[PDB]
Design a protein around this ligand. Structure first.
Ligand SMILES: Cc1nc(N)c(COP(=O)(O)O)c(C=O)c1O
Lengths: 374, 368
């Protein structure tokens, strides 16, 4: 792409050009794509979530609801603010289950301030229901769309349903800046407050004056330049990820289940995932609340053997995310379970999904998988 | 000069993050280096790994940038601020007094080396050692500075360097956490990548951060380290030129004997005499405080701005900042006096002696 070209322009024009010109352009390109009105380029999606929580008014001991089936980077900002996470198990989309969300809210001893909703592997959550539940309960909806840039629900970009949304451009996301994040949101004033926090909470004057404290979270111009170049190819990459998924479905569909995107949504299929020896009747095996304690989850025998066999042929595959309600870090925290995120870990595999792959590459990988599983 | 070359290599395909850490170890002689997305992040990890918890006391330089002390706030610890001496850094007598009067043992000291100048290290290191205080050096502006031929940042249990200055948006970015203890630095490294246990799936005993430096900025860091020493020598030449041209009207306080300040920014004081130092000894409960610049300084800044030349006041001390209202500060008047009479001069390494001559002529004209 134009990554090297833009980086060179940053170095050449640094002396003369508007401050942060490529950061500004990156924010513009994300506004153009997502149709959000406000965009703030930051050094990570974790930083964007942290600022979203702080500007939303989350304080020590407030309650924040969150997805259990996620990467801990989505929920660590709850801990930064010394707020208390409440975790919710997932549905057939991999995302927060609607019934469990309702249950969790109703059983909260204190009214939750916010929900961080992950769109996992780029799949859309059930937005109509979840947006309505948050609205009715006065809960700030923060979308963790870190892996979901290029995903849509009913023709609207994931990330634009909440008061805040976050995208990531870390090294392995559909598109990358070698590290970066974007905070988007509905409220200009809130996003501008985040922008103020992102550069050490400086008052508008000649010397350094501070009424509050902030962070060093602002994206650099060099990474902003990569971000511009990456946004130029985002749509082509989303189409190619989806092609790759459809090819895996074609080759592996006899043995693996490929759960559908919600009707009238468009998952970016950032990583192709599949479930071995799975039937939908295994879903929702329970409905319960726990206080978290650490547990291991045994991978289905065919999945651990597959990862091992492929690793020996220099092909990287990975288990799915290990649910937060099984992690020692969150010992003592409340979680609402239905069995689904543990089941998906047991039977799931994350497949090579790089957009440079041809149909033959996906076929060669798939044949090795089929040979492994027998 | 190698920035683009190295970025191109990155794109052809964390080699450069590893190389950046190695180049800092090669330069500083520290045994341990961890590249992170900012110096603030580095200070945050140093405090957490030092064992600082909510309501612990952390001692810190008053005359500094808030980026150096904001991590005390992140951990909900309590800062105690200390005024400076003739080096611009923490005064040794105030430091001892602050420690003596602390209601409970302070866990750590964040010591800034302001504008590159070395603090009085023999004394400060001994004071922290005698009192069981973890010394964290904020050497964000002091990469290339030395004290008795030992690199600033390598005296503390932890030291921190920064890469690109303080504009609200920079071309590149990055910080480096160095330190004496391999296990402590590796624990910071663990925290810097979301506190993952060593296994195939994601397992977490604790929570961490996304603070690891990107490979693209690591490439730039390696290129910057390759030219660091040449830049330091140029900075020191520029400082000497300003001193030559302006030394009749401005005081250019000496670096400590047998130290080397990187002179990363040239600074000077107008209408200043040493007998003005240590004028106003007290401690306070912090309140916001406005400090009027000396009229020759405020006028200098505007005059040069109008000739399209950028200069700035010195750092405005933390003990004068609303954010730290209520916190304790030990004072002797120096950092407020330096703010009043001080100016930060253009210090770009591309300037020639004639450029510094010309800027100085404009300076002298403005002040008479
Ligand atoms: C004295 C001093 N200390 C610190 N910690 C910093 C912060 O660096 P960074 O801007 O990479 O967070 C700066 C700004 O680079 C500084 O001048």
């Amino acid at each position: 792409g134009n990554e090297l070209k833009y980086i060179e322009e940053v170095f050449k024009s640094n002396y003369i050009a508007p401050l942060g010109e490529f950061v500004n352009r990156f924010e513009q390109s994300v506004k153009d794509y997502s149709k959000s009105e406000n965009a703030l380029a930051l050094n990570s999606a974790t930083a964007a979530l942290h600022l979203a929580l702080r500007v939303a008014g989350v304080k020590q001991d407030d309650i924040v609801l969150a997805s259990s089936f996620t990467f801990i980077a989505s929920v660590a900002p709850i801990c930064y603010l010394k707020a208390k996470p409440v975790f919710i198990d997932c549905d057939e989309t991999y995302n927060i289950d609607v019934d469990l969300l309702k249950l969790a809210i109703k059983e909260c001893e204190k009214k939750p301030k916010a929900l961080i909703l992950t769109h996992l592997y780029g799949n859309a959550a059930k937005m109509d229901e979840i947006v309505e539940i948050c609205k009715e309960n006065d809960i700030v909806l923060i979308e963790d769309a870190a892996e979901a840039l290029g995903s849509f629900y009913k023709n609207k970009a994931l990330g634009t349903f909440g008061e805040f949304g976050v995208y990531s451009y870390n090294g392995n996301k559909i598109i990358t800046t070698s590290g970066g994040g974007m905070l988007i949101g509905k409220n200009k004033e809130k996003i501008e407050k985040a922008r103020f926090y992102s550069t050490q909470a400086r008052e508008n004057c000649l010397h350094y004056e501070h009424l509050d404290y902030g962070y060093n979270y602002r994206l650099s111009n060099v990474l902003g330049a990569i971000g511009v170049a990456q946004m130029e190819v985002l749509e082509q990459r989303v189409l190619k990820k989806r092609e790759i998924y459809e090819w895996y479905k074609e080759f592996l569909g006899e043995y693996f289940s490929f759960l559908d995107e919600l009707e009238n949504s468009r998952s970016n299929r950032w990583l192709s995932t599949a479930l071995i020896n799975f039937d939908k009747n295994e879903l929702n095996a329970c409905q319960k609340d726990i206080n978290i304690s650490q547990k291991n989850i045994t991978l289905h025998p065919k999945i651990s053997k597959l990862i091992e066999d492929l690793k020996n042929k220099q092909i990287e595959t990975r288990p799915l995310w290990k649910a937060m309600h099984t992690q020692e870090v969150f010992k003592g925290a409340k979680a609402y379970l239905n069995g689904n995120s543990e089941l998906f870990f047991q039977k799931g595999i994350c497949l090579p999904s790089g957009t440079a792959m041809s149909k033959d590459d996906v076929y060669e990988i798939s044949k090795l998988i089929l040979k492994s599983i027998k």
